[PDB]
Design an enzyme around this catalytic site. Structure first.
Site, mmCIF file in Angstrom:
data_model
loop_
_atom_site.group_PDB
_atom_site.id
_atom_site.type_symbol
_atom_site.label_atom_id
_atom_site.label_comp_id
_atom_site.label_asym_id
_atom_site.label_seq_id
_atom_site.Cartn_x
_atom_site.Cartn_y
_atom_site.Cartn_z
ATOM 1 N N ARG A 76 0.873 -1.138 0.000
ATOM 2 C CA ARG A 76 0.000 0.000 0.000
ATOM 3 C C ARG A 76 0.914 1.192 0.000
ATOM 4 N NH1 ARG A 76 1.985 1.904 4.143
ATOM 5 N NH2 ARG A 76 0.888 3.893 3.804
ATOM 6 N N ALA B 4 0.599 4.839 -2.654
ATOM 7 C CA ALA B 4 0.475 5.011 -4.113
ATOM 8 C C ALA B 4 1.745 4.691 -4.939
ATOM 9 C CB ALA B 4 -0.016 6.412 -4.457
ATOM 10 N N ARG C 136 -6.713 -2.757 -7.597
ATOM 11 C CA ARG C 136 -7.485 -1.693 -6.993
ATOM 12 C C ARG C 136 -7.625 -0.609 -8.038
ATOM 13 N NH1 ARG C 136 -3.734 -1.607 -1.680
ATOM 14 N NH2 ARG C 136 -4.624 0.449 -1.195
ATOM 15 N N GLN D 100 -3.442 3.609 10.978
ATOM 16 C CA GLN D 100 -2.163 3.431 10.270
ATOM 17 C C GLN D 100 -1.015 4.206 10.921
ATOM 18 O OE1 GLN D 100 -3.600 4.096 6.259
ATOM 19 N NE2 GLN D 100 -2.501 2.279 5.477
ATOM 20 N N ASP E 149 -2.758 13.130 -0.102
ATOM 21 C CA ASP E 149 -3.152 12.241 -1.203
ATOM 22 C C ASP E 149 -3.550 12.990 -2.480
ATOM 23 O OD1 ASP E 149 -3.090 9.401 0.172
ATOM 24 O OD2 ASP E 149 -4.157 10.720 1.569
ATOM 25 N N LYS F 153 -5.734 11.821 4.702
ATOM 26 C CA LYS F 153 -6.460 10.971 5.644
ATOM 27 C C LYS F 153 -7.166 11.792 6.727
ATOM 28 C CE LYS F 153 -6.391 6.211 6.231
ATOM 29 N NZ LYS F 153 -6.788 5.229 5.186
#
Lengths: 356, 356
Positions: free
Chosen positions: A57, A59, A100, A206, A247, A258
């Site tokens: 995980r 990007a 994904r 996380q 992100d 997040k």
């Protein structure tokens, strides 16, 4: 700007995704923090399954894993005539592409290489193979060095002392070093990082599960807290500066990250604590005017009703936005791999893309 | 101030603590939200055990159960001489006092009966018994009628609409109905409450595990969320007003509550949402001048390291401040059982104790 440090000098983790002897190596992030384990995959459908799983995980790591998957296919295919190989390449590109279909860097890797191979269709088969592999390495290398630059930029602009971060933007979110993780990792080496506070970062935790493990792994000085507590530690003067990743950044510098990143910005703002986003230029989508243009993903209620393994709620309605949007005005500045960007971001971001 | 309802019309739950046919009944708060179950205690050493276990919790419910333990003793003593009966009453008072020798209301409750029995020591044996029982009921009734008052006061000054709250200041925190609990239960019945947001409230998750279940049982319209998301639902304008309990208000209106509260305060601030705290008059300490005179408790790193049952982190340092302090300026008003109080809190608060 000078890069004063190499990857080995900054972390002792291997890279998040690596290719060696016709196989793809990934740190298994599903096993963290309990157990640190590197997985070895020697087929594409295993690499593909390791992307869906979330074995990998981040990007740029989901890109690199994909790239090398094609590398893996190149150096692995039993196709004798070039025509068999190209029909099998496309088979694997589709397999990979449909992991994904939401994560955007995946599509990027897989196309960059798809176009390369459309480009040299007439070259020899053994030559095209080399090219694929090669580009897979480029893609990955590329990220580590963007990460290096970001680090050294960020270490210039952030104060010495106590830093507070959010979610996981360390080495494990990337090929290697991390966006945030680079910055603090550079600060640590310099010795300008006296303390790093980590929001465990609900609902997905996380911050607890990955960020405390990896900054801890490299001997950085880390205090894990609950999200509720960020304000308090700010109140008390225990935070000199706040750095998060992002992100997606859009035209006016508004950005999504997040959930709980907005909370921090508003608080960082009440105690006049400097607040920086860190990310490469690819994360900046100049297409989008403002923050109101960023669509908000809600995820399963189950992420809230449970916590680690256990259930913790009655069955009742839940609201689980996985990301929030932080307005540009709360940004002290934006660290990138082509330098730090200041207000006004609208103008200085288009400038930044002009000059690159 | 008119009370337009009874507890039966506002909740379908039992009293958190109750005393009936020579026995203490308490809702087992340790088994929620999985199972709902009222336990039946018959011996003072069991009632004391359930204060320790934390089967029972909340200052007035703890205070009510420690008093009812002395009710239990008075009606259960095999005593023949008054000399014997006041030895064994002292013995129990100590068993109860040695449970959670911090929780303030327990001291209060035990002492109020202790004083009453000394005062009337000349009286006949069953005269004195009756006085203990009578008195344990008062202590429990008082909390409820304060609760009921607050409820009805708070439903005045608060807007109709979506309301957001923190931790558990509901029925389960009191003898009946809660402080905050009373308020939403009143608004619900009037239909002035379209949505009640619930901060899950790490580290201990009393929002998820207690508030969601209890307001759910009464058919209120609720939504659980991650603490990190409070700011975002504020930002989208999904929040009309914020109400929270308080574990201690000092002179200037500065106050202390479950960790995360100060975070909410500053965010209501930035979106101009009205922020209110609700408590009985006994939860205001006039001795203490300002917020900085309030001791800050830390609790075990395990509360952060783990979640429900599961571990979710590697062994790294933690900061687990269990409560924050909210400076008075963030308070739109303070709701109490003797009315509502407005800035400047300092003056209107000392006034309110004279006229009482």
């Amino acid at each position: 700007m000078e890069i004063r440090y190499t990857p080995k000098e900054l972390t002792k983790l291997p890279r998040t995704v690596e290719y060696k002897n016709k196989s793809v190596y990934m740190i298994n992030q599903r096993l963290l923090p309990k157990e640190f384990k590197v997985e070895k995959f020697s087929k594409v459908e295993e690499v593909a399954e390791a992307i869906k799983n979330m074995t990998v995980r981040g990007a740029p790591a989901i890109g690199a894993a994909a790239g090398f998957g094609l590398a893996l296919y190149a150096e692995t295919s039993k196709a004798k005539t070039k025509e068999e190989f190209l029909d099998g390449f496309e088979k694997a590109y589709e397999i990979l592409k449909n992991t994904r279909p939401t994560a955007v860097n995946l599509f990027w890797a897989l196309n960059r290489i798809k176009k390369l191979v459309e480009e040299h269709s007439e070259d020899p088969l053994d030559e095209i193979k080399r090219l694929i592999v090669q580009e897979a390495y480029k893609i990955a290398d590329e990220d580590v060095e963007a990460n290096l630059r970001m680090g050294h930029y960020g270490a210039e602009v952030l104060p010495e002392g106590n830093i507070l971060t959010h979610c996981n933007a360390g080495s494990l979110a990337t090929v290697h070093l991390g966006t945030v993780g680079s910055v603090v990792r550079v600060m640590h080496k310099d010795g300008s990082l006296k303390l790093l506070w980590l929001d465990e970062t609900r609902p997905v935790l996380q911050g607890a599960r990955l960020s405390a493990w990896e900054y801890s792994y490299d001997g950085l000085n880390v205090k894990l807290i609950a999200d509720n507590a960020a304000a308090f530690v700010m109140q008390q003067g225990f935070v000199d500066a706040i750095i998060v990743g992002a992100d997606r950044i859009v035209a006016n510098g508004d950005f999504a990250n997040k959930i709980g990143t907005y909370m921090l910005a508003v608080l960082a703002r009440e105690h006049g604590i400097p607040f920086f986003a860190v990310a490469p230029l690819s994360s900046i989508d100049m297409e989008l005017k403002s923050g109101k243009d960023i669509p908000i993903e809600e995820r399963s209620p189950e992420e809230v009703l449970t916590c680690g393994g256990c259930r913790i709620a009655p069955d009742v309605p839940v609201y689980n936005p996985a990301f929030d949007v932080t307005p540009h005005k709360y940004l002290t500045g934006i660290i990138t791999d082509r330098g730090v960007v200041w207000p006004p971001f609208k103008r200085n971001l288009k400038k930044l893309f002009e000059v690159n």
